[PDB]
Design a protein around this ligand. Sequence first.
Ligand code: FES
Ligand SMILES: [K+]
Ligand SMILES: [Mg+2]
Ligand SMILES: [Mg+2]
Ligand SMILES: [Zn+2]
Lengths: 99, 38, 40, 161, 38, 43, 75, 43, 100, 177, 162
Amino acid sequence: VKCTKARYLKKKNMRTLWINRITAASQEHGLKYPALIGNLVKCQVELNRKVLADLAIYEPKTFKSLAALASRRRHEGFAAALGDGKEPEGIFSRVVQYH
Amino acid sequence: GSKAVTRHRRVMHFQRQKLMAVTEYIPPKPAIHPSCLP
Amino acid sequence: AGGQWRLQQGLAANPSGYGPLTELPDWSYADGRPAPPMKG
Amino acid sequence: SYLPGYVPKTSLSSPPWPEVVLPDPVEETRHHAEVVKKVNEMIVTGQYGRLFAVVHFASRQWKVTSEDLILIGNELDLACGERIRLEKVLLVGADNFTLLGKPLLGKDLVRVEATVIEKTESWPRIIMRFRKRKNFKKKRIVTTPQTVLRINSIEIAPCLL
Amino acid sequence: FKNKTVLKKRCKDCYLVKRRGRWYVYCKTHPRHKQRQM
Amino acid sequence: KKLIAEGPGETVLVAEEEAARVALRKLYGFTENRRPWNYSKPK
Amino acid sequence: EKDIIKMLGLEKAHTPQVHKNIPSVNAKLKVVKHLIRIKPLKLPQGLPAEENMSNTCLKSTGELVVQWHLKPVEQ
Amino acid sequence: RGRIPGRQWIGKHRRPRFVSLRAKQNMIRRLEIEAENHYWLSM
Amino acid sequence: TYSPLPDDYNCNVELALTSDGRTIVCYHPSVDIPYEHTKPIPRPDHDQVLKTRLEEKVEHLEEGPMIEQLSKMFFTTKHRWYPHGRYHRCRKNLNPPKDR
Amino acid sequence: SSFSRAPQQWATFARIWYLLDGKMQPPGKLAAMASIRLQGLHKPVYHALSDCGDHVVIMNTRHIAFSGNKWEQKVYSSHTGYPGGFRQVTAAQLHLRDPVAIVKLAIYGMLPKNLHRRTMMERLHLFPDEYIPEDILKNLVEELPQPRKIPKRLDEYTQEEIDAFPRLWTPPEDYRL
Amino acid sequence: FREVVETQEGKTTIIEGRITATPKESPNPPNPSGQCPICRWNLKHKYNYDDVLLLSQFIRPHGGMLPRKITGLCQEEHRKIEECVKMAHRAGLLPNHRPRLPEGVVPKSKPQLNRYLTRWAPGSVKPIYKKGPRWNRVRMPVGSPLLRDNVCYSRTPWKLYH
Ligand code: FES
Ligand SMILES: [K+]
Ligand SMILES: [Mg+2]
Ligand SMILES: [Mg+2]
Ligand SMILES: [Zn+2]
């Protein structure tokens, strides 16, 4: 019974582990976990926790590029919140449409 | 249980307690305090 | 994360719902032949 | 020398976070083109080594490179030895440059190929339920099919510009 | 003194003063008017 | 004054030996980052 | 309320179902209007034709598009 | 110290439950949906 | 002059978009440690007649004092330095699976 | 990185020594950053079963600052186990008796409630004053920034900032002040 | 500002009042329509206990607060400044505005305890031996409720009770 109910904990504890490792790699670049995940989704980048944590360990130079992108999209959001719509959208704030 | 009328204030159902908290008077706030204006 | 933002762009709250990522085929033959449709 | 919205400097006069000024989009547009021409010139000259890619396969994202294995938890209906191409590539990166899809990369820019080497069942998994004092007990065993792929090659093409 | 939950002056010479975190009533004319907040 | 190799170690002598090993791999081109062997059918 | 949810084919949650905007149907909806999300059906291209039944897709905006090409817009 | 007489969440003397901030927002989010439901059930 | 992150510690990140705006290019070459930010390795560490033969310095230490010396040099507790019984010493897999 | 398998493993799981200055800093904020280092939650290779913790050195623990009236209100309670052995002292009383207990008890309460916690506390080094032994001072790597920004006294402002701030009201000339 | 001096010569005491140079308000205020010095400079909800340059303009040489009919403040801001000065003295931010010590007094050496955001006077505060249960916890006040409407740049509002 424990082994059968443990298949729900394994999936939960994995995602808990990935998030803890992403949170740590984002603070090295002056970022928080919500600002990385939320702003990578805004750039149409669909990478999950498993891959991101794997990139933080084995591809550190690619993970800083993803953090710099999230910080760029985060700063564009603030700039747009200061305007009233007149100013155009940011370069990294554009969204590709699929028909 | 307890009757509908009680000498003591009766504890509400949490759904009602939440409702009473959402439906609270919110007074208007002017953009500038009237005292700061002439 | 991002469910409400995706809803503002005419997308699904879950990227698994619809769009290229889920609808498109996952593989094909190296020769170039297309693969049979997936069950889902 | 004071404007109508001037506030003398205090702790809460201005936000704690520093002011950020983004580049001019016009001047930035031509700076982006120079970086894409540089990376594209690194692909034509083959100035890169081993490559990794993030592919979406079977509802799942795999961080793969050459001559590596991935275990799939279902049947693919392919003979052992057949060579296929993984069509969805979210990311292909090298030591000095990285390419990202939005959300998927173009097919004329990256090509990942794999090979089927084994079609086998999983080890038996115990499914058992029990409820105390209700004479409730039942056992089940299942063996899910599996398929092992070997990533053969990950090659890119100079089609950025 | 005398512990009181509702302090009150009993003559013109009583004066309120906040000390040691609580309100007191002192009176030099009639020291029996002295009260401590309870 | 140009970094060609850098290696870790528990002691300063082990680290100095691994750094030399790291430089030799780069000189001969047998690094880990090197591109994989091509097994594709010859054209 | 459990019975009305069965009559309207709303057993499984987060599963869009289409109904007619008429008094009798609306009446059943006024009984479970706190269990559901109502949105109008939009037809930017119009009603699906016989040659489009297998090319449709219901978006989150409420629009029914009859040409699901799954390709970036060239515009 | 701090005993709740009897069982916590039943009876005359219960353990007090306080409304958090997200509990308010969660209820308001539901209301905005059902308020928009009244509009589409009106034509 | 704008940079999302300081390009000093790990690499030089330069983000870019394609003409169509469907791909994000990232040029990230590694930065090298300058020569001025290092230190030189410390290479440096009579009328004798009798050759100084190697003398054994294996002094006896009881279980107690020995666990205190090990827990201080490794900054641990005394508990891991105590032995275990046969039941656990025979449960350990001596031929575990090795991945790369 | 093109290293050998053994050195690559030694580097990744290496222990680093960090330095913290407790002068005019609240213990909790100090303990919040010291707790993640001791567990290794600042490493992307973190796992509980991996002894991936680091060394944290906190100096000037005698000059911490509490907010509010916590020196008087806050109480640390213990029991000797014997009848009538329940003691209750304020933070001030404890601080004068042991200038490293407050910071030590805040960190010990933030670490996980398991057997590893007493091992993480051996890798924590507290010193009341700014003096540090040579051994512990020769193996330092990085100094973590203070969380709280120490405000400046009115005697620390230069004559430029004082004259830069404008005067707001015009006092009467006939006021004794 | 006015000053008073006493000079004793020949067992005769003489008392005089002499005017001194007086500071003038800076010209061109941003908001000339403001009623008190605070809104005239758009500082409402934008100062804290640590803004001593602002607080020093409203206190005396010995650390005491100035009257409201002199400064011209509104009762709402005069109470805020009066409370932020209390907390600045307690945090050690006004070391040149100390109380006057009469002749023949040497303050004793007392435990130096650093503190900030001190609402209550230390000596009039008793320890919390019984914290209480989770639903009736005895909190420790941190800050002042008079500064609750101050401009917060975070999503978490000012917490006043720990
Ligand atoms: S702040 Fe405007 S009247 Fe005092
Ligand atoms: K009860
Ligand atoms: Mg009843
Ligand atoms: Mg009970
Ligand atoms: Zn009286």
